Amino acid sequence: GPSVFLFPPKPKDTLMISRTPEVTCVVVDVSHEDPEVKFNWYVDGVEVHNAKTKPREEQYNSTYRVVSVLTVLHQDWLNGKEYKCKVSNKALPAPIEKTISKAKGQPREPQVYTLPPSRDELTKNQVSLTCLVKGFYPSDIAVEWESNGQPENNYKTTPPVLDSDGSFFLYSKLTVDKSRWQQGNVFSCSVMHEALHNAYTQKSLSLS
Amino acid sequence: GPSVFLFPPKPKDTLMISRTPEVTCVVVDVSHEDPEVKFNWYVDGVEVHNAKTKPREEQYNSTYRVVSVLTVLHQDWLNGKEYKCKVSNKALPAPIEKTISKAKGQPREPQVYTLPPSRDELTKNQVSLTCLVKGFYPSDIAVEWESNGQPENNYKTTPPVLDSDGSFFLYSKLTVDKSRWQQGNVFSCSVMHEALHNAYTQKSLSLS
Ligand SMILES: *[C@@H]1O[C@H](CO[C@@H]2O[C@@H](C)[C@@H](O)[C@@H](O)[C@@H]2O)[C@@H](O[C@@H]2O[C@H](CO)[C@@H](O[C@@H]3O[C@H](CO[C@H]4O[C@H](CO)[C@@H](O)[C@H](O)[C@@H]4O[C@@H]4O[C@H](CO)[C@@H](O)[C@H](O)[C@H]4NC(C)=O)[C@@H](O)[C@H](O[C@H]4O[C@H](CO)[C@@H](O)[C@H](O)[C@@H]4O[C@@H]4O[C@H](CO)[C@@H](O)[C@H](O)[C@H]4NC(C)=O)[C@@H]3O)[C@H](O)[C@H]2NC(C)=O)[C@H](O)[C@H]1NC(C)=O
Ligand SMILES: *[C@@H]1O[C@H](CO[C@@H]2O[C@@H](C)[C@@H](O)[C@@H](O)[C@@H]2O)[C@@H](O[C@@H]2O[C@H](CO)[C@@H](O[C@@H]3O[C@H](CO[C@H]4O[C@H](CO)[C@@H](O)[C@H](O)[C@@H]4O[C@@H]4O[C@H](CO)[C@@H](O)[C@H](O)[C@H]4NC(C)=O)[C@@H](O)[C@H](O[C@H]4O[C@H](CO)[C@@H](O)[C@H](O)[C@@H]4O[C@@H]4O[C@H](CO)[C@@H](O)[C@H](O)[C@H]4NC(C)=O)[C@@H]3O)[C@H](O)[C@H]2NC(C)=O)[C@H](O)[C@H]1NC(C)=O
C-alpha cells in the first residue's frame, strides 16, 4: 500500500518571524483503484483545519503522489508541540499516523568567533575566513556569510560536531579573493539558533 | 545469513613506516546452528595465506562475530592494491565477497594553517586554538595536537568536508586553559597525509 513521509520546517524558517515554517506530509504509492486520500492534522492532539492539500499528481510509475502542507506558528514549533499527520486511504485497514516535533534537549547558546586568515595563507590569491560557532545545543542551526548585507556564496560549513562537554560546535569557511580582504572589505558570519537572543547574532571580520 | 564488513587500515598506520596497517574482515550474524566460517583473502586477485582469523566470539545477542585480519604492506596499500575478503558459511548459498582499496583520485597536498583564539574569546577562562587543513585529497588523514612533545587532551576534529574544488578541508579545535595560552606556551598541530612530504608536517601556534 501507500507510504507516508512527514517533513519538518527548516531551522531558518522557524527562527525568522517573516518566514513561514511548514510541515509537509507526503503520500506516495497511492493506487488508481483506491486514489482517494484524506488528511487529518493535529497539534498536541488537537485537530487543526488550516492545512492546504494540493490535488494528487501523476508519477511516471503509475501511482499517485499527494501532499498536504500545514503552516505552523513559529512559537508552537519552538515550544515543542507535536505535529501529527494521519492520512486515510481505502487500501489501508487502518489510517497511517506519523508525528514530528523539534529535537529535544536543554538549549545552549552558541558562542561565535570570527578568525582571519593565517599570515601563511596571505601568499595565496584566495584566503579563508573562519567562523567558529561553539557551545550550542540542539544541533539544529543556520550559519551564513554576507558582505554589504548581501550573501557571500563561496563558503562551506562543517557538520555539527559533538564536543567534550556535550554541546556542539562547527566551523564555517568563506573563501574570498585576497584582494577583497586587502581592500578592507568587511565580512559577516550570521548565525541563527533557537538559544540565541532573538534567535540571531552576527560577528564581523575585516583586515586589521 | 551473516553479513560481512571489510575495513581499511587506519591512515596513521599506513602513513608511518614503523606502524603496521591491517585490513579487517568481520563477519557478524553467524548462527550457533551452523557456526563455521572460512576466509579466503586476495590482493590484486592473487590469494594470500598470511591472514589471521580470530576465534569466534558470542555476542550479547546470541550470534557469533568472527574476525580475520590481514597485514598489508605500506607501499601496496598506498599504490592502490585491491584487497578482497571472501567469506564462506553453510548458511550462505555462496560466499560473500567484499573488496577494498584506498580511495581513488589524484592526491593533493594539505595546506595547514594555525589560527589563534579570537580576541572576543579572551573573556572565557578557556580558549580555542584552531588548526585549518585544506585542499587535501584522499580524505584519509590524521590530525593531532601537542605541546612540548606531549599530546593534548581536550581537542576535537571535524570530519573532512568536500570543498567546492573537489578537495577536502577540516578544522581541529584544541581547547586550553587561557593561562596556558597567555603564559606563552607553544602548541603544535601535526598532520599526516599521503601527499605530504614524508607524509607529515606540523605547524605551531603561540602568543607573541
Ligand atoms: C513512484 O514514484 C514516486 C515519485 O518519485 C519518482 O518519480 C519519478 C520521476 C522517478 O524520479 C522515481 O524516482 C520515482 O518514481 C516515488 O515516491 C518516492 O518514494 C520513496 C519511498 O519509496 C521516498 O523515499 C523517501 O525519501 C525521503 C526523503 O525525501 C526527500 O528527499 C528526497 C531526495 O533525497 C526527495 O526526492 C523527496 O521529494 C524529499 O524531498 C524533500 O521533500 C520535502 C517536502 O516537500 C521538502 O520540504 C524537502 O526540502 C525535500 N528535501 C530534499 C529535496 O531532499 C527519506 O526521508 C525516506 O527515508 C526514510 O524511509 C526509508 C524507507 O523507504 C528508510 O529506508 C530510511 O531509513 C528513512 O526511514 C526513516 O528513518 C529515519 C531515521 O532512521 C526515521 O526518523 C524515519 O521515521 C524513518 N521513516 C520511514 C521508515 O519511512 C525515503 O527514502 C521518496 O521521497 C518519494 N519521492 C517523492 C518525490 O515523493 C515512489 O517510490 C514510486 N513508487 C514505486 C516505484 O513503487
Ligand atoms: C548482534 O550484535 C552484533 C555486534 O554489535 C554489538 O552487539 C552488542 C555488543 C551491542 O551492545 C551493540 O551495541 C554492538 O554493536 C551486531 O553486529 C553489528 O552489525 C551491524 C549491522 O547490523 C554493523 O553495522 C555496520 O557498521 C559499519 C561500521 O562498523 C564500524 O563502526 C561501528 C560504529 O560506527 C563499530 O562499532 C564497528 O565495530 C565498526 O567499527 C570499526 O571496526 C573496524 C574493524 O575492527 C576498525 O578498523 C575501525 O576502527 C572501527 N571503527 C570505529 C568507529 O571504531 C558500517 O559501515 C555499516 O554500514 C554499512 O552497511 C549498511 C547496510 O548494512 C549501509 O547502510 C552502509 O552504507 C554500509 O553499507 C556499505 O556501504 C558501502 C558504500 O557506502 C558499500 O561499499 C558496502 O558494500 C555497503 N554494504 C551493504 C551491506 O550495503 C553498518 O552500519 C556493526 O558494525 C556490527 N557491530 C560490530 C561491533 O561488529 C549484529 O548486527 C547483531 N545481530 C543482530 C541480528 O541484531
Side-chain angles (χ1 to χ4, degrees), chain A residues 111 113-118 120-121 124 128-130 132 134 154 156-159 161-164 169 171-173 175 203, chain B residues 111 113-118 120-121 124 128-130 132 134 154 156-159 161-164 169 171-173 175 203:
Chain A
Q111 304 140 29
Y113 303 113
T114 50
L115 318 179
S118 162
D120 286 349
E121 202 181 28
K124 306 288 170 301
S128 310
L129 277 27
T130 301
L132 164 59
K134 63 173 240 128
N154 198 27
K156 289 289 194 185
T157 303
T158 76
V161 175
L162 187 70
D163 215 339
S164 57
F169 74 97
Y171 278 90
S172 185
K173 179 168 63 73
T175 295
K203 293 292 202 296
Chain B
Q111 305 159 40
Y113 303 114
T114 52
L115 311 176
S118 174
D120 289 334
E121 192 176 34
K124 302 311 170 214
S128 312
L129 277 48
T130 291
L132 193 207
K134 62 158 273 173
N154 205 14
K156 287 286 187 181
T157 304
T158 74
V161 178
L162 185 64
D163 215 337
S164 44
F169 71 92
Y171 285 89
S172 184
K173 184 173 62 72
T175 296
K203 308 293 288 304

Side-chain angles (χ1 to χ4, degrees), chain B residues 3-10 22-30 54 58-67 69 97-99:
Chain B
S3 288
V4 15
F5 303 100
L6 216 214
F7 298 97
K10 323 292 192 296
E22 307 171 343
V23 293
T24 308
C25 189
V26 3
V27 191
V28 305
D29 291 344
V30 172
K54 293 165 121 188
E58 187 170 17
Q59 309 302 283
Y60 286 125
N61 59 46
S62 31
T63 65
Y64 288 124
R65 193 179 75 109
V66 197
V67 181
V69 303
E97 314 180 358
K98 296 306 185 164
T99 60

Side-chain angles (χ1 to χ4, degrees), chain A residues 111-200:
Chain A
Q111 304 140 29
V112 6
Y113 303 113
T114 50
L115 318 179
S118 162
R119 44 149 32 258
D120 286 349
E121 202 181 28
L122 254 17
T123 99
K124 306 288 170 301
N125 35 11
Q126 299 203 300
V127 308
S128 310
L129 277 27
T130 301
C131 182
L132 164 59
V133 184
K134 63 173 240 128
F136 65 93
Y137 203 79
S139 64
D140 308 75
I141 198 163
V143 175
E144 298 183 342
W145 287 89
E146 7 190 285
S147 183
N148 203 13
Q150 71 192 15
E152 287 281 351
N153 77 285
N154 198 27
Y155 65 94
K156 289 289 194 185
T157 303
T158 76
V161 175
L162 187 70
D163 215 339
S164 57
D165 67 355
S167 67
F168 287 102
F169 74 97
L170 96 222
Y171 278 90
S172 185
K173 179 168 63 73
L174 166 65
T175 295
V176 308
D177 289 337
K178 200 238 310 304
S179 60
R180 297 182 71 201
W181 174 250
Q182 239 83 17
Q183 298 162 22
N185 291 18
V186 179
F187 297 87
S188 300
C189 173
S190 276
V191 184
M192 294 141 279
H193 185 280
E194 63 198 87
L196 286 174
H197 182 17
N198 293 315
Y200 179 87

Side-chain angles (χ1 to χ4, degrees), chain B residues 129 146-149 180-181 184-188 204-207:
Chain B
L129 277 48
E146 61 177 25
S147 170
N148 289 264
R180 293 185 72 204
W181 177 246
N185 293 271
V186 173
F187 297 88
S188 297
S204 294
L205 182 64
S206 75
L207 181 55

Side-chain angles (χ1 to χ4, degrees), chain A residues 31 70 195:
Chain A
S31 70
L70 175 68

